[PDB]
UniProtKB/Swiss-Prot annotation, chains A, B, C, D:
Domain of life, source organism: Eukaryota
Annotated consequence of substituting residue 197 to I: Suppresses the 475 nm excitation peak, leaving only the shorter wavelength peak at 399 nm. In H9; increases fluorescence at 395 nm excitation
Effect caused by changing residue 63 to L: In RSGFP4; increases fluorescence and shifts the major exitation peak to 489-490 nm
Keyword Isomerase on entry: no
Name recorded for this polypeptide: Green fluorescent protein
InterPro entries with a match to the protein in the record: GFP, GFP-related, Green_fluorescent_prot
Resulting phenotype, residue 218 to R: In Azurite; shifts the excitation and emission spectra to shorter wavelengths and increases quantum yields compared to BFP
Impact upon substituting residue 139 to C: In mut1.9; shifts fluorescence lifetime from 3.03 to 2.74 ns
Mutation effect (residue 170 to A): In mut2.1; shifts fluorescence lifetime from 3.03 to 2.50 ns
Organism of provenance: Aequorea victoria (Water jellyfish)
Effect of residue 63 to M: In Citrinine; leads to excitation and emission peaks of 516 and 529 nm, respectively
Effect of residue 61 to M: In RSGFP4; increases fluorescence and shifts the major exitation peak to 489-490 nm
A single BP term in Gene Ontology: bioluminescence
C-alpha cells in the first residue's frame, strides 16, 4: 500500500453535495506526492456556482498523501489501507451554524487515487458565514490529531479548522473524522500522532468557472 | 516594471541576521510567478542552525510577486518600483517577546529578483516562543493591508501574523512595514487594499541542512 | 549525451576577462574523466599575469565531468545537454568586495570539450583580497547545490566558495549559477541534488608562465 | 636525506587502529613526488569497513613529500630525517567528541617510503560525526604550522582540520603533532613555517573494498 505513494500519484476528487437542499457537484483533479507531503488539486463546480464557500470544503476534498517520517511509517493508516482504500466520514460542525456530514471513499481506481465524496449540510443560516459566503478565500494551518479506533479497525481524527471571515473574525469548523478500510484486510493502526496540515487556496486567473486551486502540505508528527 | 513579472522569475533571498547577538545567514532561492501569485522558495541556514524558528522569518524572506487582479494593477507599487527595486523595512513585534527590525533591498540583479536582507532581533526571551523554538512549523493565512505613503513615494503595510505554538497557543507578530523605491523613476502608489497571502512551509526530506521550503500564494484584493 | 563522457575527454578552456578594467585571458587544457568524476586541467594566463587570484577563477574554469552514480544519472543535466552544450552563466559575488559575472558556453567542438568563457568583474576593492592577491593558492571542498530550472530548461546552482585568506580569515565567494542548453532537444532536468566538489591547486614547477594546475574530483550526491 | 625524494617515491601506508573498541586496519599505497609536492595514495580498509569516516584519518595516513621551495629546503625536517626516518605522533582532538592519538614511524624501507601507524581513538560519541559517519567524503585546505622542537630534536605542528559535516556544519579536528627522528643522524630543524596542504578525496569506481584515493599537494611556505 505504502509504495503506491512513492511517486506522484494522480488524484480525482468527486463531490455530490447538498447544503440546505442546494445540490451541487465538484470535480477535482490533481496530483499528490506523499514523499513531500504535497497535494495540488483543482476543483471545478460542475453544477454552476458553489452554494457554500470553497474553504469549507478543503478537508472534504486524501490524507494518504501525507508525508509520514520514515520512523512513523508504522502509524500510516491511510496508505496501508490502499489500493482498496478507506471510507472517510466527517461531521464538520461550524460553530454558530450548521454542519456537513460527509462520507467518502478514497481508493485507487487504476493508477489514480480517487476521493468520491457525498456531503450533506443541514441547519445552515442564510445570514451566517457559510451561506452568506462570509469566509475569506484563504486557509490556515491545522493539526489533524489522529487516534486508533480499534473497534472499527480504522482511525478517528479530531480538529477545529479556523476559517477567516472578512470582518476579522473566525468561523470554527469542528471536524469529527473516522476512517475505516474498504479492505479485505490489513491496516496499520496508529499510536496518537497528528497530521500538520497547511493549505494555500488560489484561483487559475484564466479560469472562468467557479473553482479552487488547493495547494496543501501534510506532515505526520507528534511521535518522536 | 510590471512586465518583468509576467513569466516565472528566479528569486534569490539573502539574509544576515542577528537575534540577541546570534548572527546567522540564510540563502534562499526559488522562483516567483506573479501571474499566479506564487512563490516557491527554499532557504538554507548557511551558518549552521537557525537561532530562531523558520516561521518567524517567512515575511522577511518579495511581494512584487503578488497577483494583482486586472482592475487593481494600478495599485501595484511593488512591480512598478522594478527593476531598480524597493527597500522594505519592517519592525516585526512579537507580542510579549521581542522584535525584528529588517531592511531589505528587493530588486532585479540581472534576470533574477533578489531580496537582500539585514535583520536585527532584540528583547527576545530565551524562555519565550522564538528563542525557545516553540512555534510549529507551519504558517497561516494573513492579509497584508497596504496603504500609500505618498511622501516617501512608497507604501506602508500593517498586519499581525499568527504563529501557531506546539502547546496550543498563538504568538502574534506585529509587522509594521514600509516600502520605498530605489530608483529615481516614478512608482505607482495605491489606494487602500490588501495582499491576501497564504503560506505552506515544508522540508526537503533529502536535505540535511536546516532549511525551509516556502510555498506562498499572494493575491491583491479589497478593491472592487 | 551521457556516453560522450565514458572515456577521457580532452578539455580546452578559454577565458577572456575584465576585472576592474584589467583585461586578461587564460587558456586551459587537460582532460576530464566522468567515470571517476575527475578533471586534470592546466590554465596558462596568456596575457602575462592574472589580475586576480587564480582560485577566484576555479569555478569559472565543466561540471559535465561530474560523476553521477548510476541511480542518479537521470539527474545529470550537464551531460544531457551534450554535444551541443549549455551555457553556464554565473554571478560570483565576493563578500565585502566585487563580483564576477560570467557567461560561458560549454559544448563539444569535435572530440574535445570546450568551456569558452567571458568574465566581467566589477566593483572590486584594489586593497581587497582579490585585487590585493590576498588569497592562498589553495582550494576547499564545496557542494554545488543544483535545482531545476524548468523554465530555462536548465539548472540553477547555488554555493558559497570558501576562499582562505593569508591572515586565517575566509573570503566567501557567493556563486549564483544558471545553465540553459544551447541545443533545442529536451534535456534531463534534475531533482535537488548537489555536486560534491573537491579541488587541489598545484603549480607546474617547469612552467614559467602564470598558471594553475587544477585537479578536481566532482561527485553528484544528495539523492538516495 | 633530501635527494631520496627527487623522483617518484613508492609509499606504503599501514594503519592499525582502535576507535572506541573498533579495531581496524588500512593498507595504503601509492607514490609521492616531492618535486611537485604531490601524493597519490589509495587506502583499502583491510578489515572490511572503516569504523570512522575516511577523512578523519587523512592526516594520519607522509609530509616528507612536501615541496620545499629551494630557499626553505634548510627547513625541511621531514626529508632530513631520512632514510632512518622519524616518528610522527599526533593527538587529533575532534571538537566536542573523541580524540585520535597516533604514533607512526615514517621511514624508508628499501626503495619505498613507509608510514606505519597505530591509532587509538577513545571517547567518541556514537551519535557523533565520527562514529555516526556524519562527515562528507571530502577535504579542505589547511596550513600545517611547523615549529621546531629543539628539545626533541624534531618538530611540533599545529592545525585545525575542517571537516564538513553533511548538514553543512564543520567538525574541527584539532591536530597536535610532534615528530622526532628515529636514527642517530643529524636533522635540519626549522624556523616557523607551514605546509600548505591541499587534498581531494576520491573513490576508485572499480574498487569494491571500503577505500579512499587521496590526492594531496603539499607546499612549504611562510618563509620569504
Amino acid at each position: 500500500g505504502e509504495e503506491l505513494f512513492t511517486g506522484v500519484v494522480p488524484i480525482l476528487v468527486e463531490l455530490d453535495g447538498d447544503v440546505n437542499g442546494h445540490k451541487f457537484s465538484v470535480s477535482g483533479e490533481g496530483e499528490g506526492d506523499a514523499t513531500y507531503g504535497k497535494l495540488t488539486l483543482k476543483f471545478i463546480c460542475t453544477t454552476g456556482k458553489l452554494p457554500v464557500p470553497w474553504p469549507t470544503l478543503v478537508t472534504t476534498f486524501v490524507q494518504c498523501f501525507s508525508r509520514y517520517p520514515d520512523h512513523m511509517k508504522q502509524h500510516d493508516f491511510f496508505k496501508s489501507a490502499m489500493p482498496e482504500g478507506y471510507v472517510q466520514e466527517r461531521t464538520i460542525s461550524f460553530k454558530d451554524d450548521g454542519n456537513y456530514k460527509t462520507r467518502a471513499e478514497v481508493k485507487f481506481e487504476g493508477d489514480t487515487l480517487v476521493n468520491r465524496i457525498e456531503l450533506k449540510g443541514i441547519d445552515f443560516k442564510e445570514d451566517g458565514n457559510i451561506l452568506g459566503h462570509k469566509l475569506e478565500y484563504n486557509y490556515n494551518s491545522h493539526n489533524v490529531y489522529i487516534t486508533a479506533d480499534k473497534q472499527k479497525n480504522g482511525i478517528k481524527a479530531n480538529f477545529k479548522i479556523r476559517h477567516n471571515i472578512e470582518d476579522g473574525s473566525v468561523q470554527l469548523a469542528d471536524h469529527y473524522q473516522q476512517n475505516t478500510p474498504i479492505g479485505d484486510g490489513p491496516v496499520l493502526l496508529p499510536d496518537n500522532h497528528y497530521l500538520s496540515t497547511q493549505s494555500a487556496l488560489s484561483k487559475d486567473p484564466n479560469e472562468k468557472r467557479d473553482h479552487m486551486v488547493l495547494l496543501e502540505f501534510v506532515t505526520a508528527a507528534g511521535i518522536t
